[PDB]
Amino acid sequence: VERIVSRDIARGYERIPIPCVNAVDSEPCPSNYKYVSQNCVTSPMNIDRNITHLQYCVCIDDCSSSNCMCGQLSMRCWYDKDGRLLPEFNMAEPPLIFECNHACSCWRNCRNRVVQNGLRARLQLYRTRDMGWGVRSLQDIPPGTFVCEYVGELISDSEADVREEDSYLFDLDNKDGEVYCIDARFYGNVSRFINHHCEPNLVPVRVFMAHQDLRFPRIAFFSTRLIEAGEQLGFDYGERFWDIKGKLFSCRCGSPKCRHS
Amino acid sequence: VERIVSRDIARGYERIPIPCVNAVDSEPCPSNYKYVSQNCVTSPMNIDRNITHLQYCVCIDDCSSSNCMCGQLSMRCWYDKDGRLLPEFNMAEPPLIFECNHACSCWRNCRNRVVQNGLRARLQLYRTRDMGWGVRSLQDIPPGTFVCEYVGELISDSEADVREEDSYLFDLDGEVYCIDARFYGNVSRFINHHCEPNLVPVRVFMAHQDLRFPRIAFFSTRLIEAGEQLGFDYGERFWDIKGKLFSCRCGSPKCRHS
Numbered sequence: 204v205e206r207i208v209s210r211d212i213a214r215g216y217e218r219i220p221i222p223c224v225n226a227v228d229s230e231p232c233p234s235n236y237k238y239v240s241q242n243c244v245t246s247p248m249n250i251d252r253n254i255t256h257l258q259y260c261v262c263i264d265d266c267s268s269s270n271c272m273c274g275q276l277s278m279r280c281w282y283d284k285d286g287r288l289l290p291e292f293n294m295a296e297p298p299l300i301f302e303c304n305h306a307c308s309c310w311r312n313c314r315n316r317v318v319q320n321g322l323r324a325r326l327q328l329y330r331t332r333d334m335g336w337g338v339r340s341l342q343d344i345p346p347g348t349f350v351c352e353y354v355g356e357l358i359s360d361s362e363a364d365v366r367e368e369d370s371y372l373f374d375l376d377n378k379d380g381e382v383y384c385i386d387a388r389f390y391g392n393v394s395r396f397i398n399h400h401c402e403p404n405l406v407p408v409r410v411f412m413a414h415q416d417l418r419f420p421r422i423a424f425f426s427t428r429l430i431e432a433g434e435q436l437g438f439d440y441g442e443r444f445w446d447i448k449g450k451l452f453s454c455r456c457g458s459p460k461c462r463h464s
Numbered sequence: 465v466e467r468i469v470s471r472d473i474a475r476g477y478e479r480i481p482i483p484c485v486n487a488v489d490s491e492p493c494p495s496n497y498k499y500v501s502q503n504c505v506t507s508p509m510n511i512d513r514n515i516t517h518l519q520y521c522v523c524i525d526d527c528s529s530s531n532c533m534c535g536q537l538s539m540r541c542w543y544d545k546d547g548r549l550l551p552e553f554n555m556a557e558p559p560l561i562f563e564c565n566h567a568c569s570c571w572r573n574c575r576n577r578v579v580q581n582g583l584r585a586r587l588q589l590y591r592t593r594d595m596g597w598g599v600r601s602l603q604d605i606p607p608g609t610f611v612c613e614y615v616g617e618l619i620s621d622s623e624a625d626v627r628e629e630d631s632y633l634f635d636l637d638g639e640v641y642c643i644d645a646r647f648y649g650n651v652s653r654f655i656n657h658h659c660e661p662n663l664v665p666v667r668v669f670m671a672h673q674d675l676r677f678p679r680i681a682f683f684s685t686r687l688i689e690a691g692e693q694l695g696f697d698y699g700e701r702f703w704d705i706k707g708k709l710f711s712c713r714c715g716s717p718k719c720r721h722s
C-alpha cells in the first residue's frame with residue numbers, strides 16, 4: 204500500500220506542493236535536514252552583490268529580439284515563448300545562462316526569466332526499492348523544461364575538504380583558482396533527493412540571476428528529453444562522486460549503458 | 465485633464481501596477497532613479513546571513529499561540545488573521561516585529577508573515593499642486609494594514625555623510641546605517657511628509673536578524689480613504705536641515721514645521 208507521509212515537504216514555500224509517499228517500507232518522511240527553497244550560507248561567502256556590477260539590457264520589448272544584451276552574454280537567449288530551451292541547446296556542453304535582472308530596462312515578465320520564477324513542475328518524493336528516497340515527476344515534462352534548482356548551503360572548497368558527509372555535494376565552477384560547493388546535507392531542497400543516472404533525464408545548467416558573481420553560479424536542472432509521468436528524475440553526479448563512492452558501492456541506475464556498475 | 469504618464473512605474477515587479485498620472489503640469493514620469501522592489505547595495509554591507517544565527521520557532525500550528533518564539537521576540541505577534549496590526553499595537557512607539565523565517569518549523573502561510581509577502585494595496589504616483597510628486601491610495605485601506613516598505617540603497621553613516629542629495633534618506637538609527645532611495649528606490653521614495661501622518665514606519669526582521677539592518681515597513685495609522693495622499697513623519701533630523709530652506713506644506717491644523 205502507498206502511504207502518504209507528507210502532503211508537502213516544502214511546507215508551502217514552493218509554487219506547488221511536493222508530497223512524499225512510501226509504498227516500500229516503514230520509513231517516515233525524512234527529517235534529518237532542513238528544507239530550504241533557496242540557497243543559504245553558514246560561514247559568509249561575500250558574494251558580489253554591488254548593483255552597479257550587474258551587466259543588464261536596455262530592451263524596449265519582451266527581450267525576444269536579437270538585440271537583448273542579456274541573451275548576448277548567454278550567446279543568445281535560449282528560452283522559447285514557453286520558457287523551454289531551444290532545440291539547438293547543447294545538452295552535452297551547456298552554456299552559462301544570464302537571465303534578466305532588476306537592473307535591466309525590461310519588465311519582470313520578459314522572455315529571459317525562467318529559473319528566477321521558481322519550481323513549477325509537479326514533483327513527488329517517494330521511496331525507491333533499492334536507492335533510498337528518490338524524486339519522480341507526476342506529469343509529462345517536455346524536453347528543455349526547467350525542473351528544479353540544486354539548492355543548499357554554499358561552502359568553500361576548504362570547508363568541503365573537512366566535511367565528512369559528502370553524498371549531497373555539488374561542485375561549482377573553478378574561477379581563477381577559487382572553487383565553491385553546494386552542500387545539501389543539512390539544508391537543501393527537493394534536489395537533494397535526486398538519484399544518479401548514467402543516461403540522465405536532467406542536465407545541470409549554470410545560471411545567473413540576481414547577481415553575476417561567476418564563483419557562484421546557480422545550478423538549474425533542465426529536462427534532456429520528454430520525461431513521462433511517473434518517471435524517476437536523475438542527473439549524472441559526475442566522475443568525482445564515483446571516484447570516491449565506487450569503492451563503497453556500485454551504480455544501481457540500471458542503464459544498459461551504465462558507466463559505474 | 466489627468467494624463468496617464470506611466471501605466472506602471474515598477475515595470476511589473478510589484479503584485480499590482482503602480483501607475484503615474486499628472487493633472488497639474490507638463491512634467492513627465494520621473495526617470496532620474498532606478499525603481500527596485502527590494503533593498504540593494506553598492507558597497508558591501510556584510511549583513512549577517514548565517515542561517516544558524518537565526519532565532520526561529522518550532523510551532524506545529526499557524527503561529528497564533530503565545531509559545532511562538534517569533535511572537536515572543538516581537539513581544540507578541542501583532543497580526544490578526546488578515547495581516548493587520550492589532551488595536552493594542554503602539555503606533556506612537558512601535559516595537560520591533562520579528563516575522564517567521566525559513567528556519568522556523570511552521571508553514572509559509574502562518575499568521576506571523578505579512579511584510580515578507582510584499583506590497584498589496586493599489587497605489588498611484590501623482591503630481592501634487594505644491595509638493596512635487598506624491599503617492600495616493602486608490603482604495604480604502606483599513607487601520608493597521610501594511611502599505612509599502614521604504615526600499616533603497618543600504619549605506620553606512622560614513623557614506624551618507626558624503627552624499628550631496630539627502631532628501632531621500634531614511635535613518636536606521638555608534639555604528640548606524642541609512643537607506644538612500646535617491647538613486648535606487650521603490651514607490652516609498654515619493655511619499656511626502658505629513659505632521660499627522662496616515663503611515664507609521666515599523667522596523668521589521670524577516671530573512672535575517674542583523675539588528676543593524678531593520679527593514680522599514682509602513683503601516684496605516686487609521687482608515688485611509690480612497691484617493692487620499694499617503695504621508696509619514698520624516699522626523700526631526702530632516703526638518704532640522706530642510707527647515708532653513710522651506711517650511712512644511714502638509715496643511716495639518718497641527719503642523720509642527722510650518
Ligand SMILES: COc1cc2nc(N(C)C3CCCC3)nc(NC3CCN(C)CC3)c2cc1OC
Pocket residue numbers: 359360361363364365366367368369370372373374382383384440441443444445447448
Ligand atoms: C559531486 O560529488 C562530490 C563532490 C565532492 N567534492 C569535494 N570537493 C572538495 C570539491 C571542492 C572543490 C573541488 C572538489 N569533496 C568531496 N568529498 C571530500 C572527500 C574527502 N572528505 C574528507 C571530504 C569530502 C566530494 C564528494 C562528492 O561525492 C562523493
Ligand SMILES: COc1cc2nc(N(C)C3CCCC3)nc(NC3CCN(C)CC3)c2cc1OC
Pocket residue numbers: 620621622624625626627628630631633634635640641642698699701702703705706
Ligand atoms: C531622515 O532625513 C535625513 C536623514 C539624514 N541622515 C544623515 N546621516 C548622516 C545619517 C547617518 C548618521 C545619522 C544620520 N545625513 C543627512 N544629511 C547630511 C547633511 C550633510 N550632507 C553633506 C550629507 C547628508 C540626512 C538628511 C535627512 O533629510 C534631509
Ligand SMILES: C[S@@+](CC[C@H](N)C(=O)[O-])C[C@H]1O[C@@H](n2cnc3c(N)ncnc32)[C@H](O)[C@@H]1O
Pocket residue numbers: 334335336337370371395396397398399400448452453454455456
Ligand atoms: C544525494 S543522495 C540521493 C538521495 C538518497 N537516495 C537518499 O535517500 O537520501 C545520494 C545517495 O543516494 C544513493 N544513490 C543515488 N544514486 C545512486 C545510484 N545510481 N546507485 C546507487 N546508489 C545511489 C547513494 O547512497 C548516494 O550516495
Ligand SMILES: C[S@@+](CC[C@H](N)C(=O)[O-])C[C@H]1O[C@@H](n2cnc3c(N)ncnc32)[C@H](O)[C@@H]1O
Pocket residue numbers: 595596597598631632653654655656657658706710711712713714
Ligand atoms: C522624499 S521626497 C518626496 C517626493 C518629492 N515630492 C518628489 O517630487 O520627488 C522629499 C521632498 O519632497 C518635498 N516634500 C515632502 N514633504 C513635504 C512637505 N510636507 N512640505 C513641503 N515639501 C515636502 C520636499 O522637497 C522634500 O525634500
Ligand SMILES: [Zn+2]
Pocket residue numbers: 260261262265266270271272273274303307309315
Ligand atoms: Zn533584454
Ligand SMILES: [Zn+2]
Pocket residue numbers: 259260261266272273302303304307308309315
Ligand atoms: Zn536583461
Ligand SMILES: [Zn+2]
Pocket residue numbers: 260262265266303304307309310313314315
Ligand atoms: Zn529582459
Ligand SMILES: [Zn+2]
Pocket residue numbers: 400401454455456457458460461462463464
Ligand atoms: Zn549507472
Ligand SMILES: [Zn+2]
Pocket residue numbers: 521522523526527531532533534535564568570576
Ligand atoms: Zn511560530
Ligand SMILES: [Zn+2]
Pocket residue numbers: 520521522527532533534563564565568569570576
Ligand atoms: Zn517563526
Ligand SMILES: [Zn+2]
Pocket residue numbers: 521523526527564565568570571574575576
Ligand atoms: Zn510561523
Ligand SMILES: [Zn+2]
Pocket residue numbers: 658659712713714715716718719720721722
Ligand atoms: Zn506639517
